[PDB]
Amino acid sequence: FLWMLGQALVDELTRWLQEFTRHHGTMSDVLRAERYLLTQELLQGGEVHRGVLDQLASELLLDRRLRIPELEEAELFAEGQGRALRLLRAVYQCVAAHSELLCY
């Protein structure tokens, strides 16, 4: 039982870490979606105009309504990962959010 009890606490920690990196997460997602489209144009061989971005921090997520495909399925894979994988993702997220405090 102790293994499963420990797993519950792992999830609690993961939740806290996710809240500690929330703002960073939002900023990232805005820029990831923008990058998705940006790279398409680059790969075509055409120019990256402002219209690319127009097709699409917290506010900008709501305003944008161009729901992308790949990125959404990727999020599902992430949610459907094991607790171990997800806990480690949480740790990376925290470090990459507050990098200054690490250097120090």
Partner: protein, 506 residues
């Protein structure tokens, strides 16, 4: 008849083993040595002419009873020399008439969990046969070289010649096998006819030794390997006579696993022949190992796979004429096996060079994106574990490539690659010099691997996609700044509001 069939397939070898026992029953006089010759004759014909071997199978075991008879009749000490021949003939009899014909028929190619286990075991058996069908000239060639690298002579020298001029040119492989079998038996016979009483007091191989089995055990195991190889060839032939693609790589993890078990030396082959030359110049460190060094740095320098494929004809000839000459200078020698392991690897890449002419998503990111960064940590720990002057060079290359790294991971291939190739030349120079002037080569070999792996990531088609992402981030940097600054200003305002509220209340 189950056990009769077991004996009609896996028991003819009992007669063969017994042949040896008779021949090696104490002081071997002429007759016991001729007994050996008869055992040898049987196994030799098996290789040379399979059809004819089958034709005189039990006829030869009947001739066996014939020989054993005369011996025991003419010749407790004396009774022990009658006992063994008797035992031999008894075993023959059983196969001779009762299992010999159903064996000639086995060779004629022209509860609950027990069933589950049987199927599992069946899968294993079939697979292992396939592997040992193609990966057996290797073990034959390697063993005949280890034997003739220990017992340096002028009668085991011919065996080196055979399996070192038939590995580069692979059309001779059948005739190599044939001539090795006869010659290994000539060696066995001569060395035995030297354990006689009239043969008393080495360059030519033949010498005397008190344990007769132990003495002629080495060359006997070679005869064994050779013959076992032929058995596997024909057994696999019988199986099918009677009874992992590119696409798979991009599907599931198991799909990729299969692709590599099928082809690993197909793709990563020039890289493994170069990591074998680094081993020679790291375990030998003499002066004849410096020419292996100069070949590495004159093959590596022609950076195109196509150009390298025109020098492979000579790399392979050189490596074969060097093993022989170094073993002629060892007869007038157990580290020359690194010059073999490399004539093997390179003869096999000469084959690819003329035959190409005819959650997995998670792993691919951590190999095609976050590996450049691991190579850079290895460069540091290659040069800070071995304190020398060469080691400082590594430390200082890590520093350069960390600073100007982001720009490198973005530049067009031309350059991306120039820098990498340069870093590869520091490695090779270090390796070839630590030798000319003599802490060793191990840590510079872990490094030579990693850097040759990243040259392949930086020349793939899956890296094109990571270049795209990295290029895009440099363009969308301005947006990033705006997002951040907006967030900062928003929080500033909220805090400022709260303070003004307090001052109003006060």
């Amino acid at each position: 008849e189950l056990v009769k069939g077991v004996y009609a397939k896996y028991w003819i070898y009992v007669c063969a083993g017994m042949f040896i026992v008779v021949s090696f029953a104490g002081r071997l006089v002429v007759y016991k040595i001729v007994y050996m010759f008869l055992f040898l004759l049987c196994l030799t014909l098996f290789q040379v002419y399979y059809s004819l071997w089958r034709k005189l199978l039990k006829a030869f075991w009947w001739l066996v009873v014939a020989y054993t008879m005369l011996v025991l009749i003419a010749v407790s000490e004396l009774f022990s020399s009658i006992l063994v021949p008797g035992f031999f003939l008894l075993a023959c009899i059983l196969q001779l008439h009762y299992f010999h014909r159903p064996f000639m028929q086995l060779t004629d190619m022209e509860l609950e969990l027990a069933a589950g286990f049987s199927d599992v075991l069946s899968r294993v058996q079939v697979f292992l046969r396939r592997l040992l069908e193609l990966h057996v000239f290797k073990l034959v060639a390697l063993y005949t070289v280890w034997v003739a690298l220990k017992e340096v002579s002028v009668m085991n020298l011919l065996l080196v010649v055979l399996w070192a001029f038939a590995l580069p040119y692979p059309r001779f492989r059948p005739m190599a096998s044939c001539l090795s079998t006869v010659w290994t038996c000539v060696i066995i016979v001569c060395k035995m006819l030297y354990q006689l009483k009239v043969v008393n007091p080495n360059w030519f191989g033949v010498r005397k030794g008190f344990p007769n089995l132990g003495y002629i055990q080495n060359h006997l195991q070679v005869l064994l390997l050779l013959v076992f190889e032929a058995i596997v060839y024909r057994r696999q032939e019988h199986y099918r006579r009677q009874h992992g693609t590119r696409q798979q790589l991009d599907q599931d993890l198991l799909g990729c696993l299969k692709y590599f078990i099928n082809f690993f030396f197909y793709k990563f082959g020039l890289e493994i022949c170069f990591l074998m030359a680094v081993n020679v110049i790291g375990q030998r460190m003499n002066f004849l190992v410096t020419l292996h060094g100069c070949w590495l740095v004159a093959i590596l320098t022609r950076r195109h796979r196509q150009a390298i494929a025109r020098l492979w004809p000579n790399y392979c000839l050189f490596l074969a004429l060097f093993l022989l000459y170094q073993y002629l200078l060892c007869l007038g020698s157990t580290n020359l096996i690194s010059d073999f392991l490399l004539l093997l690897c390179a003869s096999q890449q000469w084959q690819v060079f003329s035959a190409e002419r005819t959650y997995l998503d998670m792993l691919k990111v951590a190999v095609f994106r976050y590996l450049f960064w691991l190579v850079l940590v290895v460069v540091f720990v290659t040069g800070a574990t071995r304190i020398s002057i060469f080691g400082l060079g590594y430390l200082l290359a890590c520093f350069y490539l960390l600073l100007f790294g982001t720009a490198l991971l973005q530049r067009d291939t031309r350059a991306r690659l120039v820098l990498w190739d340069c870093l590869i030349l520091y490695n090779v120079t270090v390796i070839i010099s630590k030798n000319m002037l003599s802490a060793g080569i191990i840590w510079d070999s872990v490094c030579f691997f990693f850097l040759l792996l990243q040259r392949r990531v930086f020349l793939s088609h899956y890296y094109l996609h990571v270049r795209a992402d990295l290029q895009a981030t440099a363009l969308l940097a301005s947006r990033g700044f705006a997002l951040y600054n907006a967030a900062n200003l928003k929080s500033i305002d909220f805090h400022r509001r709260i303070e003004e509220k307090s001052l109003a209340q006060l």
